[PDB]
Design a protein around this ligand. Structure first.
Ligand SMILES: CN(c1ccc2cncc(NC(=O)Cc3cccc(Cl)c3)c2c1)S(C)(=O)=O
Ligand SMILES: CN(c1ccc2cncc(NC(=O)Cc3cccc(Cl)c3)c2c1)S(C)(=O)=O
Ligand SMILES: [Cl-]
Lengths: 298, 305
């Protein structure tokens, strides 16, 4: 019993964090094999013009109390790749994957190449993340684990004026319509991840919280008409299919759980809580709920 | 900016998790130097659990009865002893991944990270607090016994909790790393219930200071209170009494924001009376009590927005 916001064990990622310094700027880098990946804004814009003026010895890479030797450098989108002389002996089995909004991942927040905390979060539908980052956290990474393979999905680049965060995948492509520069940028109007709220309502049922269940059902179209009015993302037939296992385990059909969500949206919680929360939680995917209510290890 | 429930990086603890098997029971152990620490109930059958005599059950065991597995490597048990409710298995190999560590016993209200494990394999990490009733609101399934709670302040891992059991309400009970239970619990299947739980007042106040540091002031008011009047109101909402020690501990946050502790106590009194009225504080519609004053200072900036 119990339901917590749970992150993946961070050990395989901790063994990859390094400190990257260029001039007066210091941030974090990800050392995999003989390459250190970090935000290209470490050289700060015309990034190609700024990069051509830098030599290998300008980039100081520190792995713990050991200085790494930069033997090459190249840029891929908004990510700088520093070729080093030494391959990381702690390099785990890994992939670079781009995630979609609604998907969740763990963030290992770092300062000066030293990991300080791990938290779980979701890629919002507006492509921002509601993280917890201070100055010096640039280069901190987001990841998931599949068996023994670490899938790197996010690298932190900046904070927006509302306190939310923007970053790229590990190939340097930003999530969202953001750019790596000091300019007027704002996060779009955010929406609630509907498939994730439904998964969390299934997790509440599994944990013995059934007060919100009702005898009613709904059509997918009527649910989407109601959901669009509360700034909830549309629920597709794919989402319904993905909720299949949880629906079969609890005995509550997905459209039956949608009618519960409709009543919660139109009438509120009425002083009650679900899994210790007075708000509808959308940062647990259907897979996160199955994994936490099954005991999958890494 | 931003405020998340943040756990310590778990790498230093992952390198210590092993699987301990005795008969048909399998659970987790913590391998530090040449000793594996695990719940002593690993020697019990489900029948033994009502009234087990651990001394009587342990004297019947030999070293080769305990199977310890570290990854895909079998460790050799060369000795065994019981210290309170933990079993200490002396092994023939020191863990090369042993971090710098201490065993610390925590007080209610204190927070820590939990590395939940099954079969000696870590599956997840979360942050939680020792409730005033000495239970933890964890997320544990069968096989999680032996999973540990820790803090990593600087480079030293302070182990503070080892998971032993789930109570009928779904909450969890465990010991420090010296085998002493937190709370009036016993490692027996006898009728045991968690006492009435209360809100950790000093932690809610710390979290209201974190909200002010992050630019939110909607809940503040022009009032102050005496410590006694605050406690009379707080106890009516099942909030722990705020002691002068708690007031002293909130000193740094009070000086950083410019809001006196008893003035923040007055905002808390008002929040309990009024509710939130459709508003949130740090993305939460409830008053959060699982961030200590130390967690807020560690996570938040030194410059108030
Ligand atoms: C220095 N400060 C912070 C605070 C939290 C921060 C959290 N994450 C990243 C930061 N870094 C940038 O956003 C740098 C930047 C600026 C423009 C374009 C890019 Cl791509 C990158 C953060 C900076 S403060 C208190 O707001 O003055
Ligand atoms: C109710 N069950 C669970 C579920 C979550 C559990 C979470 N943590 C620990 C468990 N183990 C015990 O509590 C074993 C025990 C029993 C009595 C006294 C002690 Cl010291 C230890 C858990 C057992 S189940 C599904 O039937 O396996
Ligand atoms: Cl303590």
């Amino acid at each position: 019993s119990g339901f917590r916001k749970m992150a993946f064990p961070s050990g395989k990622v901790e063994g990859c964090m390094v400190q990257v310094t260029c001039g007066t700027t210091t941030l974090n880098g990800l050392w995999l094999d003989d390459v250190v990946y970090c935000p290209r804004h470490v050289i700060c814009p015309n990034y190609e013009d700024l990069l051509i003026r830098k030599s290998n010895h300008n980039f100081l890479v520190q792995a713990g109390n050991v200085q790494l030797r930069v033997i090459g450098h190249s840029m891929q989108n908004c990510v700088l790749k520093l070729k080093v002389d030494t391959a990381n002996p702690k390099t785990p089995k890994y992939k670079f994957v781009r995630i979609q909004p609604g998907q969740t991942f763990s963030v290992l927040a770092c300062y000066n190449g030293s990991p300080s905390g791990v938290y779980q979060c979701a890629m919002r539908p507006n492509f921002t993340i509601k993280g917890s980052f201070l100055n010096g956290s640039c280069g901190s990474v987001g990841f998931n684990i599949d068996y023994d393979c670490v899938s790197f999905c996010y690298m932190h680049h900046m904070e927006l004026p509302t306190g939310v965060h923007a970053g790229t995948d590990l190939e340097g492509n930003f999530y969202g319509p953001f750019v790596d520069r000091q300019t007027a940028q704002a996060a779009g109007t955010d929406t609630t991840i509907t498939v994730n709220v439904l998964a969390w309502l299934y997790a509440a049922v599994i944990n013995g919280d059934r007060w919100f269940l009702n005898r009613f059902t709904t059509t997918l179209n009527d649910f989407n008409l109601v959901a669009m009015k509360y700034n909830y993302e549309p629920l597709t037939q794919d989402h319904v299919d993905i909720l299949g296992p949880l629906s079969a385990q609890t005995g509550i059909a997905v459209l039956d759980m949608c009618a519960s969500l409709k009543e919660l949206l139109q009438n509120g919680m009425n002083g009650r809580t679900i899994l210790g929360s007075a708000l509808l939680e959308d940062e647990f995917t259907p897979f996160d709920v199955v994994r936490q209510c099954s005991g999958v290890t890494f």
